Amino acid sequence: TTCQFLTKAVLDNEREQLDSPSARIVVGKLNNVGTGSFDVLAKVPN
Amino acid sequence: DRLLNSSDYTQASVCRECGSILTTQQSVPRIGSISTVCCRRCSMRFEDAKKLIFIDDSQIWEDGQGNKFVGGNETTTVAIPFVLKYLDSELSAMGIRLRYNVEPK
Amino acid sequence: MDISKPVGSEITSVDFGILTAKEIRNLSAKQITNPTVLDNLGHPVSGGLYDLALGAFLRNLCSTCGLDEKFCPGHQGHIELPVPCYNPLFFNQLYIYLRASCLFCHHFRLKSVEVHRYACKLRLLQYGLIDESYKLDEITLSSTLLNELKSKRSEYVDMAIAKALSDGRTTERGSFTATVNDERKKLVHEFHKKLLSRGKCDNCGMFSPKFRKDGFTKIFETALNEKQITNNRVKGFIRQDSTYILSTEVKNILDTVFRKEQCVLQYVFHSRPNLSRKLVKADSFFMDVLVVPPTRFRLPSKLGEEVHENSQNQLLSKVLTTSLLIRDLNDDLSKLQKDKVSLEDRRVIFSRLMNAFVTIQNDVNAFIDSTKAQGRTSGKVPIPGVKQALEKKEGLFRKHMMGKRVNYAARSVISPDPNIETNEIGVPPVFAVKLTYPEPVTAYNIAELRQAVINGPDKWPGATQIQNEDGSLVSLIGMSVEQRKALANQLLTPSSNVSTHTLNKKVYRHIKNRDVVLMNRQPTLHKASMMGHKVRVLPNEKTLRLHYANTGAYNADFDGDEMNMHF
Amino acid sequence: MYKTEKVDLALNRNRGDPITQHFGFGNDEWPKEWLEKLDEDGLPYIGTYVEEGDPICAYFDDTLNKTKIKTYHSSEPAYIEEVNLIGDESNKFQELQTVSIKYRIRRTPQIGDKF
Amino acid sequence: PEDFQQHEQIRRKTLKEKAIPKDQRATTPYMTKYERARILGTRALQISMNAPVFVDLEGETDPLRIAMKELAEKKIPLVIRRYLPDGSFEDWSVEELIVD
Amino acid sequence: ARFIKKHKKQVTNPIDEKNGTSNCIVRVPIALYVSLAPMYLENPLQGVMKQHLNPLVMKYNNKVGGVVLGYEGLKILDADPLSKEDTSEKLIKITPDTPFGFTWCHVNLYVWQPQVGDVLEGYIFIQSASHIGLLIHDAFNASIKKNNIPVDWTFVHGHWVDSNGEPIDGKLRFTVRNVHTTGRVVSVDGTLI
Amino acid sequence: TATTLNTPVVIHATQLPQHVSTDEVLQFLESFIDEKETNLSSSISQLKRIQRDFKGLP
Amino acid sequence: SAAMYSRFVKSALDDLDKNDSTQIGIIANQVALPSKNPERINDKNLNILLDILSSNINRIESSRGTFLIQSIINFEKWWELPPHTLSKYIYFIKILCSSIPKWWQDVSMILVSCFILPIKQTVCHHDMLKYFLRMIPSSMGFIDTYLAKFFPNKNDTRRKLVNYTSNLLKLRGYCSELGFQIWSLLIEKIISIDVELQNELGIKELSTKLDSILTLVSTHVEEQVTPESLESGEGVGVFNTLTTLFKTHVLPTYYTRSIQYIMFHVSQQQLELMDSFLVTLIDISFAVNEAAEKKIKSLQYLGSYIARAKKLSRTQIIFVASYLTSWLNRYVIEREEEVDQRGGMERFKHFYAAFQALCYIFCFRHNIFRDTDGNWECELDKFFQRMVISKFNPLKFCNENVMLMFARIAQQESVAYCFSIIENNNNERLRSSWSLATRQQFIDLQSYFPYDPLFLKNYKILMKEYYIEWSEA
Amino acid sequence: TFIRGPICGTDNCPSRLWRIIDGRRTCQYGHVM
Ligand SMILES: [Zn+2]
Ligand SMILES: [Zn+2]
Ligand SMILES: [Zn+2]
Ligand SMILES: [Zn+2]
């Protein structure tokens, strides 16, 4: 019930921390599941 | 890719300062100068800014109509689904404001 | 999405809030005031809904940025509402606080001590301190005692938050889990129940007239009852040291109550600590302006050959007419003295004003909302307002996020084949020649891609275009063999430009046996109805060929059922 | 398979209006490849093979001072079977405004056909 | 301005205290099936854009296959940062993880 | 109650001795968040230099509020917060979508930051009846508009003449009226009153 | 023009700028010019002119 | 009139200090008109307007003044104005960009765009570019991009192309610092020259185009590079940047017919230029880091060059032979043992590549390798045979037509006898293995000779002094 | 394949736009944008 939950969010001055799968799809953020559950770094010499 | 790439992937401007993706525009520059990306919310009408130190040249921008503005230069681009812009637009019709916190500051 | 256009900035959270009429006026690209949208030559009417400051429209260039219908993002403008309106989203909450108010001392009619006890609890819950909010209730040792009680509860909350911050248990940003959110919601409900449960004001002892509503956002004020007027003048000495009621009266009442009861409201309206330090204002429940969304979100439609107006514009222009009309009522209203001037016109002016407020309020309701609009000409069925557009049919989430129309990819009837591998898919050349990966050109593949470009759009395995380092595309379609051979020899030339020096060209090739696609048969009820297969291009085929070992997964029958191939 | 399409360039005109568009060719300069599909009347020769994008109709538009062309839209190629001139009643005088074109599409039975 | 610097140093310090001592690591010494796939894809991406390559190509033209080869010889200069659910993390080098 | 006014020219540039001009050369430490292309994965410092720093040289930069002359002591901040500032092996986080890295860096910038009010000296290279054109440190453009030159100064066909009837030449001392920075190259507006 | 390839995403001064003596400006110009030996070429050319002026010349 | 107009403007300026702005705008609009419209402000009045504006430019440096200024910068065909009036326009522009550097951006853009005009008609444009590049060195940035932006397209008229290069060369000669970027631009046109000519080997067009362009470039370079200019000059600069662009563009793309003759030709101006090119080629063809295909392309270049370049000295040639036999003798001594081991004959691409080049060199210049005695330099008689009978069996893997011609000639000179090894080779063929997926690119790479004869009318004639046709050898 | 309109988005034409259904739009020398 989109507008109801929205009304509730506004009146709470809520922050969407963007952790749920739904929220991340909304904002275009890579999902928190899966191959996304860790970071990759490169070992560089010199 | 599907949401990402098919879906409506869009590089869009945000104001890092007010966190909006709806109040940015390209400046309209004098001929010879280059256009920059500015926030209509975070900047003063030129007159009002004078009416309150010296004001640097890089801090003034203009629109097509011709009004001069001071400030609003804290913009970048973020990758969002286009439909987000539509949702934000509809919400502001209803008097509702989304504020995106962008990093790095 | 292009791997050679990286993005540095990243959105990390979103904050919900309310646009103030000050913000809107400042950001606005144009104030819209004309109901009329086009002129006799089909150009945008200036100051109308297609005004070019709101963005490029058709041929015309945007007057704000100067960009064409393609690169102009659109800009918002605003309408000036000549008289405040309730924001239809929030009218119920407004109703609660209005009813709860004491129109005499301007606190809530609930005793200050109780209200403070709620403020203490909610404040503790901003930091996730659930145990502490119950301990707060454990505090007890007539108006002199109460302020010491209030005071000692207050010093407990501070001590608890301080202690909680020093050890691990919270940050200044608060702590917000489900169990916390549950306790918070209960309290706010309990608080609201207690607000409306009071008759006589616990603080000054007076009775305020009761407020009643509509389903169409109108507020009536029922004058005082006999026992209650008697009770009120008895308290007359201590204070010495039905009807429609306008939205402006309501706003004034709440404005003052929100000043006085600010402490509690500061926590009722913030689930997290309010670092921003903004006051909670009554205005938040009202609109003095409407944001006109950019022209690109309000374009006309073409139903085949005939062109139809945008329905959101039809609604906005009704706001515009009423607006002009009220600005005229307001003009004749000032051309009273009536210092002279005979009273009754007072009744007629009010009659016209009530009329205006009601119908603008209806048009707003209808948009947020056609529900809040009076059913039209009994029949027709209502025209959807913005609320219904966002919520209508299956809704944005289900129709354009869960599910989407898609671009690259193919569909075909499937046919059985025992001669391909159980992990392959037999691809007809008709597909193989039209589907390209964008392949980046490198030392290791320059031979291959040279040949593809030479082969062209129509000989498989070939290519349909080349992306240059400056992002531009070159079509291989109209081309001769020599022109193609030329482009094929410049695939790997160095950079003559520092800005694009990190990029290489891309060849939009036809796909081949090295490749992987995603096969899909609907309904897709488990993940094995969407698997990755290795490509095997098969000459002379017109359908997709699939080994039997896969029917189980896809639930495929070979009775003319179709599959999708995604690349 | 047979498909019948109705081309009716009285579709826009506001009721017994002056006639803007008449089947045939104008004297301005127009492709000429057009005559491969179309006879002098602006109707297609019977029997003609016709694939997506080809002309199936040519008329002269007065408001444009140009000779324009209704094109064939199916992605499946076909042949022209019957071209019917649907004249109008209300006593003659009126020139040609309505035509029916019947396309013939070959179906050698394909993969995916049901038996 | 002086104190934003301080703020950043605190953020980054606590992040590392999540991101943790090498000798206090506690997760699986095996490379996960997820880590493997992403390591391959990402290293393949870098190969496609002229990353210095640490192995003999021997005629290979598929950058994924080149990555696989690099993985086999443990010459992939990537590090996996594993996040525990409180946001603290362990850094594991591709070479040190047991691959299978 | 609100401070965007933290874009106010705070140069302060000191007056000199044995001399009379303002020293505007300054050394400012910066942090900068930059991309590293995959081709530089074995030469990250080289890459940061060729991609980001080198293009800043001898151009005005809005953030340091002057012209960048050059840079010293580039350092990459290891994404591994547990390593010693010593080691030459560092981590740079890779974009999810692309093969590019992004890291923070520290470097030192040398900046010529003439603020308004400062006293500079220029070498005269042009004299019309409309302005005097100078070159500061034989590098940066200056210009004194016709009515920033004192009223009793006269012109001829040409070349200017001062209060006492003698022509001006070579080195001239002026004060900064405004610094134009948005054009192709920096340009100083100077006054003599 | 400016992309993520040639332009920092953001720049911040970490301290107040410190003024430098002429002797320092000269020592810096010296080494910076040496270390860096098309846009860069025409720029060290200009730096070369500035270091000339700081030694007093034409 | 004469003095009436002097009033009109003098009024207009007063009126501008009051902000009415009408009078000015009337004037501006009058000057903005097209070169064609009779109603455009005439010379005499323009003389006046200009000299008045120049005399106190500060009166105009305002938002109100912008439009007027824009209208004068945008004055059509100003270079076409009569002497005296032209002079006043120039002095005005000079004055303007001095008190207001901002406008230099607008003025120079129009200037560069005029580079499509003939040399005789540009003096004023260059005079102005020279002036302001000097006084505003920072401009070199955007004005360089102009050099890019306004380059005529390949389709555009030849006179446009030939002009716009004539000017760029002229520009080069007073703004050296842009020199590299310039040469990079011309070369990168480079690619269009590569386009012109190979495929064809309309087409009649590209011939005379590409022909007019190269003949120009090379004659300008013949002048730019000279011994005097090499010791104290920027001759060195030109060679360098042309050699760099050869390594980055010509060699790789590496199927160009237009274009590698710039290096063929400058090379042979002076003995050291040749030396630098040879050693440069040698470098690229035997460097350990470079990709094999690069090494093979260089080796083709190397062999083609030695064969063709007329101005080469006997000893520079023997130098290349001495390098190749030396490098070859080592290969066979250190590697022959690897043939009967696991792998294919492709492992030895590089060997054949070098042996080809040397054979090729012997075809064109065998008459030189006989010293006074009648003996062979580098023991070519004894040397060739050794390779021919080696396990690499060069004769089978190198270009077929060269190996054949080498056979013919070598046999004739009592230098080597290959013809039985050839017989054996294509017999074994009818009845030492290499994939053919990758075996073809090699056969392709070994077929291309970057200095096989030219087919552009003029260039050919110009090259004659620097070229050995097969008939000559 | 012609429509003349929209010159060409390449400043070495402007040569002459036809749109293919795939939306590349193609100019004769062979820019596809
Ligand atoms: Zn903003
Ligand atoms: Zn716009
Ligand atoms: Zn009360
Ligand atoms: Zn084009």
PDB file of N, CA and C in Angstrom, chain E residues 5 8 11-13 15-17 19-22 38 42-43 45-46 48-52 54 77-79 81 83 89 91 95, chain F residues 31 37-43 77-84 89 91 93-101 103-106:
ATOM      1  N   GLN E   5      39.166  15.776   9.098  1.00  0.00           N
ATOM      2  CA  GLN E   5      40.313  14.886   8.944  1.00  0.00           C
ATOM      3  C   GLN E   5      40.291  13.873  10.063  1.00  0.00           C
ATOM      4  N   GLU E   8      37.448  11.375   9.629  1.00  0.00           N
ATOM      5  CA  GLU E   8      37.805  10.369   8.641  1.00  0.00           C
ATOM      6  C   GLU E   8      38.744   9.329   9.237  1.00  0.00           C
ATOM      7  N   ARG E  11      36.777   6.934  11.367  1.00  0.00           N
ATOM      8  CA  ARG E  11      35.997   6.044  10.517  1.00  0.00           C
ATOM      9  C   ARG E  11      36.881   4.939   9.971  1.00  0.00           C
ATOM     10  N   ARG E  12      37.991   5.343   9.369  1.00  0.00           N
ATOM     11  CA  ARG E  12      38.873   4.410   8.705  1.00  0.00           C
ATOM     12  C   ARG E  12      39.545   3.465   9.682  1.00  0.00           C
ATOM     13  N   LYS E  13      39.905   3.977  10.851  1.00  0.00           N
ATOM     14  CA  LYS E  13      40.478   3.140  11.894  1.00  0.00           C
ATOM     15  C   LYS E  13      39.485   2.067  12.379  1.00  0.00           C
ATOM     16  N   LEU E  15      36.891   0.918  10.861  1.00  0.00           N
ATOM     17  CA  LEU E  15      36.695   0.019   9.731  1.00  0.00           C
ATOM     18  C   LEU E  15      37.804  -1.046   9.669  1.00  0.00           C
ATOM     19  N   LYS E  16      39.049  -0.645   9.884  1.00  0.00           N
ATOM     20  CA  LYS E  16      40.143  -1.615   9.870  1.00  0.00           C
ATOM     21  C   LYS E  16      40.067  -2.575  11.062  1.00  0.00           C
ATOM     22  N   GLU E  17      39.584  -2.093  12.202  1.00  0.00           N
ATOM     23  CA  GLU E  17      39.445  -2.932  13.391  1.00  0.00           C
ATOM     24  C   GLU E  17      38.363  -3.988  13.216  1.00  0.00           C
ATOM     25  N   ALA E  19      38.203  -4.792   9.976  1.00  0.00           N
ATOM     26  CA  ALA E  19      38.880  -5.395   8.834  1.00  0.00           C
ATOM     27  C   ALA E  19      40.198  -6.069   9.210  1.00  0.00           C
ATOM     28  N   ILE E  20      40.643  -5.847  10.446  1.00  0.00           N
ATOM     29  CA  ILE E  20      40.925  -6.905  11.422  1.00  0.00           C
ATOM     30  C   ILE E  20      42.384  -7.359  11.361  1.00  0.00           C
ATOM     31  N   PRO E  21      42.853  -7.998  12.428  1.00  0.00           N
ATOM     32  CA  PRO E  21      44.173  -8.636  12.416  1.00  0.00           C
ATOM     33  C   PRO E  21      44.207  -9.845  11.489  1.00  0.00           C
ATOM     34  N   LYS E  22      45.285  -9.994  10.726  1.00  0.00           N
ATOM     35  CA  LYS E  22      45.551 -11.262  10.040  1.00  0.00           C
ATOM     36  C   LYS E  22      45.548 -12.476  10.966  1.00  0.00           C
ATOM     37  N   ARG E  38      33.729 -14.586  -8.738  1.00  0.00           N
ATOM     38  CA  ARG E  38      33.920 -13.161  -8.869  1.00  0.00           C
ATOM     39  C   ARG E  38      35.374 -12.825  -9.144  1.00  0.00           C
ATOM     40  N   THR E  42      36.329 -10.691 -12.415  1.00  0.00           N
ATOM     41  CA  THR E  42      36.914  -9.387 -12.214  1.00  0.00           C
ATOM     42  C   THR E  42      38.323  -9.349 -12.781  1.00  0.00           C
ATOM     43  N   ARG E  43      39.100 -10.385 -12.509  1.00  0.00           N
ATOM     44  CA  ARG E  43      40.437 -10.454 -13.078  1.00  0.00           C
ATOM     45  C   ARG E  43      40.355 -10.530 -14.604  1.00  0.00           C
ATOM     46  N   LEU E  45      38.076  -9.111 -16.393  1.00  0.00           N
ATOM     47  CA  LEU E  45      37.759  -7.755 -16.803  1.00  0.00           C
ATOM     48  C   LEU E  45      39.043  -6.926 -16.899  1.00  0.00           C
ATOM     49  N   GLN E  46      39.945  -7.106 -15.944  1.00  0.00           N
ATOM     50  CA  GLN E  46      41.142  -6.287 -15.915  1.00  0.00           C
ATOM     51  C   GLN E  46      42.042  -6.705 -17.049  1.00  0.00           C
ATOM     52  N   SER E  48      40.999  -7.755 -19.906  1.00  0.00           N
ATOM     53  CA  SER E  48      40.438  -7.229 -21.134  1.00  0.00           C
ATOM     54  C   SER E  48      40.833  -5.766 -21.340  1.00  0.00           C
ATOM     55  N   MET E  49      41.352  -5.130 -20.306  1.00  0.00           N
ATOM     56  CA  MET E  49      41.733  -3.728 -20.469  1.00  0.00           C
ATOM     57  C   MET E  49      43.195  -3.520 -20.135  1.00  0.00           C
ATOM     58  N   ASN E  50      43.986  -4.525 -20.499  1.00  0.00           N
ATOM     59  CA  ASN E  50      45.436  -4.421 -20.571  1.00  0.00           C
ATOM     60  C   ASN E  50      46.133  -4.367 -19.234  1.00  0.00           C
ATOM     61  N   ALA E  51      45.552  -5.020 -18.246  1.00  0.00           N
ATOM     62  CA  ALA E  51      46.296  -5.271 -17.034  1.00  0.00           C
ATOM     63  C   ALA E  51      47.522  -6.107 -17.402  1.00  0.00           C
ATOM     64  N   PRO E  52      48.658  -5.808 -16.777  1.00  0.00           N
ATOM     65  CA  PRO E  52      49.835  -6.665 -16.891  1.00  0.00           C
ATOM     66  C   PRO E  52      49.454  -8.081 -16.519  1.00  0.00           C
ATOM     67  N   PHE E  54      50.351 -12.146 -15.728  1.00  0.00           N
ATOM     68  CA  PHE E  54      51.416 -12.800 -14.990  1.00  0.00           C
ATOM     69  C   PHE E  54      51.670 -14.234 -15.440  1.00  0.00           C
ATOM     70  N   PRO E  77      46.645 -11.067  -8.446  1.00  0.00           N
ATOM     71  CA  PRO E  77      46.947 -10.044  -7.430  1.00  0.00           C
ATOM     72  C   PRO E  77      45.698  -9.402  -6.847  1.00  0.00           C
ATOM     73  N   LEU E  78      44.733 -10.216  -6.449  1.00  0.00           N
ATOM     74  CA  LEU E  78      43.509  -9.720  -5.859  1.00  0.00           C
ATOM     75  C   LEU E  78      43.350 -10.198  -4.415  1.00  0.00           C
ATOM     76  N   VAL E  79      42.556  -9.459  -3.660  1.00  0.00           N
ATOM     77  CA  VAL E  79      42.348  -9.740  -2.256  1.00  0.00           C
ATOM     78  C   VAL E  79      40.855  -9.732  -1.989  1.00  0.00           C
ATOM     79  N   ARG E  81      37.871  -9.176   0.530  1.00  0.00           N
ATOM     80  CA  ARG E  81      37.509  -8.609   1.817  1.00  0.00           C
ATOM     81  C   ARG E  81      36.149  -9.144   2.245  1.00  0.00           C
ATOM     82  N   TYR E  83      33.076  -9.599   4.750  1.00  0.00           N
ATOM     83  CA  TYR E  83      32.378  -8.834   5.774  1.00  0.00           C
ATOM     84  C   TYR E  83      31.577  -9.734   6.694  1.00  0.00           C
ATOM     85  N   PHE E  89      35.644  -6.804   9.028  1.00  0.00           N
ATOM     86  CA  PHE E  89      36.011  -7.610   7.881  1.00  0.00           C
ATOM     87  C   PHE E  89      37.364  -8.296   8.013  1.00  0.00           C
ATOM     88  N   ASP E  91      40.611  -9.489   5.547  1.00  0.00           N
ATOM     89  CA  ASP E  91      41.239  -9.516   4.219  1.00  0.00           C
ATOM     90  C   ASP E  91      41.958 -10.842   3.953  1.00  0.00           C
ATOM     91  N   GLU E  95      45.963 -15.787  -3.231  1.00  0.00           N
ATOM     92  CA  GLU E  95      46.967 -16.847  -3.202  1.00  0.00           C
ATOM     93  C   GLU E  95      46.901 -17.710  -1.950  1.00  0.00           C
TER      94      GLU E  95
ATOM     95  N   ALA F  31      44.044  16.026   0.045  1.00  0.00           N
ATOM     96  CA  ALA F  31      43.589  14.661  -0.153  1.00  0.00           C
ATOM     97  C   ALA F  31      42.742  14.698  -1.407  1.00  0.00           C
ATOM     98  N   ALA F  37      43.444   3.577 -13.684  1.00  0.00           N
ATOM     99  CA  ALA F  37      43.132   2.736 -14.833  1.00  0.00           C
ATOM    100  C   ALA F  37      43.865   1.409 -14.721  1.00  0.00           C
ATOM    101  N   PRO F  38      43.277   0.353 -15.265  1.00  0.00           N
ATOM    102  CA  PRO F  38      43.871  -0.982 -15.202  1.00  0.00           C
ATOM    103  C   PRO F  38      45.278  -1.076 -15.782  1.00  0.00           C
ATOM    104  N   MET F  39      45.586  -0.248 -16.774  1.00  0.00           N
ATOM    105  CA  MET F  39      46.922  -0.276 -17.358  1.00  0.00           C
ATOM    106  C   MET F  39      48.027   0.111 -16.353  1.00  0.00           C
ATOM    107  N   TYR F  40      47.642   0.750 -15.253  1.00  0.00           N
ATOM    108  CA  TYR F  40      48.615   1.256 -14.297  1.00  0.00           C
ATOM    109  C   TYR F  40      48.730   0.391 -13.036  1.00  0.00           C
ATOM    110  N   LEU F  41      48.094  -0.772 -13.060  1.00  0.00           N
ATOM    111  CA  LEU F  41      48.038  -1.642 -11.888  1.00  0.00           C
ATOM    112  C   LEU F  41      49.405  -2.037 -11.340  1.00  0.00           C
ATOM    113  N   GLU F  42      50.452  -1.905 -12.157  1.00  0.00           N
ATOM    114  CA  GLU F  42      51.807  -2.208 -11.705  1.00  0.00           C
ATOM    115  C   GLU F  42      52.586  -0.937 -11.418  1.00  0.00           C
ATOM    116  N   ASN F  43      52.002   0.202 -11.781  1.00  0.00           N
ATOM    117  CA  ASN F  43      52.605   1.513 -11.556  1.00  0.00           C
ATOM    118  C   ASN F  43      51.630   2.542 -10.982  1.00  0.00           C
ATOM    119  N   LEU F  77      46.674   6.071  -0.043  1.00  0.00           N
ATOM    120  CA  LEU F  77      46.200   5.563   1.229  1.00  0.00           C
ATOM    121  C   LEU F  77      45.706   4.151   1.018  1.00  0.00           C
ATOM    122  N   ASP F  78      46.423   3.210   1.611  1.00  0.00           N
ATOM    123  CA  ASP F  78      46.066   1.810   1.525  1.00  0.00           C
ATOM    124  C   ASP F  78      44.645   1.556   2.025  1.00  0.00           C
ATOM    125  N   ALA F  79      43.815   0.901   1.217  1.00  0.00           N
ATOM    126  CA  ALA F  79      42.486   0.457   1.671  1.00  0.00           C
ATOM    127  C   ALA F  79      42.566  -0.581   2.773  1.00  0.00           C
ATOM    128  N   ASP F  80      43.734  -1.204   2.935  1.00  0.00           N
ATOM    129  CA  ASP F  80      44.002  -2.072   4.085  1.00  0.00           C
ATOM    130  C   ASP F  80      44.501  -1.218   5.245  1.00  0.00           C
ATOM    131  N   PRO F  81      43.642  -0.980   6.227  1.00  0.00           N
ATOM    132  CA  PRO F  81      43.990  -0.042   7.280  1.00  0.00           C
ATOM    133  C   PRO F  81      44.968  -0.671   8.253  1.00  0.00           C
ATOM    134  N   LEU F  82      45.273  -1.949   8.058  1.00  0.00           N
ATOM    135  CA  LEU F  82      46.122  -2.676   8.997  1.00  0.00           C
ATOM    136  C   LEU F  82      47.598  -2.673   8.605  1.00  0.00           C
ATOM    137  N   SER F  83      47.901  -2.229   7.391  1.00  0.00           N
ATOM    138  CA  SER F  83      49.283  -2.205   6.925  1.00  0.00           C
ATOM    139  C   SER F  83      50.051  -0.991   7.452  1.00  0.00           C
ATOM    140  N   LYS F  84      51.382  -1.070   7.393  1.00  0.00           N
ATOM    141  CA  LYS F  84      52.271   0.012   7.827  1.00  0.00           C
ATOM    142  C   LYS F  84      52.410   1.035   6.703  1.00  0.00           C
ATOM    143  N   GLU F  89      53.383  -2.605  -1.064  1.00  0.00           N
ATOM    144  CA  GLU F  89      52.199  -3.329  -1.544  1.00  0.00           C
ATOM    145  C   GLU F  89      50.928  -2.771  -0.909  1.00  0.00           C
ATOM    146  N   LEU F  91      46.383  -1.893  -1.217  1.00  0.00           N
ATOM    147  CA  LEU F  91      45.093  -2.269  -1.776  1.00  0.00           C
ATOM    148  C   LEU F  91      44.319  -1.091  -2.340  1.00  0.00           C
ATOM    149  N   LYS F  93      40.481  -0.529  -3.949  1.00  0.00           N
ATOM    150  CA  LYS F  93      39.174  -1.153  -4.214  1.00  0.00           C
ATOM    151  C   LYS F  93      38.717  -0.950  -5.654  1.00  0.00           C
ATOM    152  N   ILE F  94      38.259  -2.038  -6.275  1.00  0.00           N
ATOM    153  CA  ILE F  94      37.823  -2.018  -7.659  1.00  0.00           C
ATOM    154  C   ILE F  94      36.329  -1.799  -7.732  1.00  0.00           C
ATOM    155  N   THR F  95      35.908  -0.948  -8.661  1.00  0.00           N
ATOM    156  CA  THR F  95      34.499  -0.676  -8.928  1.00  0.00           C
ATOM    157  C   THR F  95      33.766  -1.975  -9.114  1.00  0.00           C
ATOM    158  N   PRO F  96      32.538  -2.056  -8.614  1.00  0.00           N
ATOM    159  CA  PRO F  96      31.744  -3.231  -8.974  1.00  0.00           C
ATOM    160  C   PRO F  96      31.561  -3.350 -10.499  1.00  0.00           C
ATOM    161  N   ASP F  97      31.033  -2.313 -11.140  1.00  0.00           N
ATOM    162  CA  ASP F  97      30.757  -2.375 -12.579  1.00  0.00           C
ATOM    163  C   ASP F  97      31.976  -2.422 -13.530  1.00  0.00           C
ATOM    164  N   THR F  98      33.098  -1.785 -13.172  1.00  0.00           N
ATOM    165  CA  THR F  98      34.206  -1.597 -14.123  1.00  0.00           C
ATOM    166  C   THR F  98      35.519  -2.125 -13.568  1.00  0.00           C
ATOM    167  N   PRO F  99      36.558  -2.241 -14.420  1.00  0.00           N
ATOM    168  CA  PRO F  99      37.869  -2.668 -13.916  1.00  0.00           C
ATOM    169  C   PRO F  99      38.683  -1.564 -13.256  1.00  0.00           C
ATOM    170  N   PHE F 100      38.127  -0.360 -13.129  1.00  0.00           N
ATOM    171  CA  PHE F 100      38.882   0.764 -12.576  1.00  0.00           C
ATOM    172  C   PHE F 100      38.968   0.737 -11.056  1.00  0.00           C
ATOM    173  N   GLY F 101      40.108   1.144 -10.515  1.00  0.00           N
ATOM    174  CA  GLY F 101      40.208   1.348  -9.085  1.00  0.00           C
ATOM    175  C   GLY F 101      39.840   2.782  -8.736  1.00  0.00           C
ATOM    176  N   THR F 103      41.135   5.273  -5.365  1.00  0.00           N
ATOM    177  CA  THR F 103      41.776   5.349  -4.072  1.00  0.00           C
ATOM    178  C   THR F 103      41.853   6.793  -3.593  1.00  0.00           C
ATOM    179  N   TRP F 104      42.033   6.983  -2.291  1.00  0.00           N
ATOM    180  CA  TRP F 104      42.399   8.294  -1.768  1.00  0.00           C
ATOM    181  C   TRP F 104      43.890   8.481  -1.918  1.00  0.00           C
ATOM    182  N   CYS F 105      44.318   9.727  -2.092  1.00  0.00           N
ATOM    183  CA  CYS F 105      45.742  10.054  -2.117  1.00  0.00           C
ATOM    184  C   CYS F 105      46.035  11.265  -1.279  1.00  0.00           C
ATOM    185  N   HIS F 106      47.234  11.331  -0.728  1.00  0.00           N
ATOM    186  CA  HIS F 106      47.714  12.594  -0.183  1.00  0.00           C
ATOM    187  C   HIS F 106      48.836  13.117  -1.067  1.00  0.00           C
TER     188      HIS F 106
END
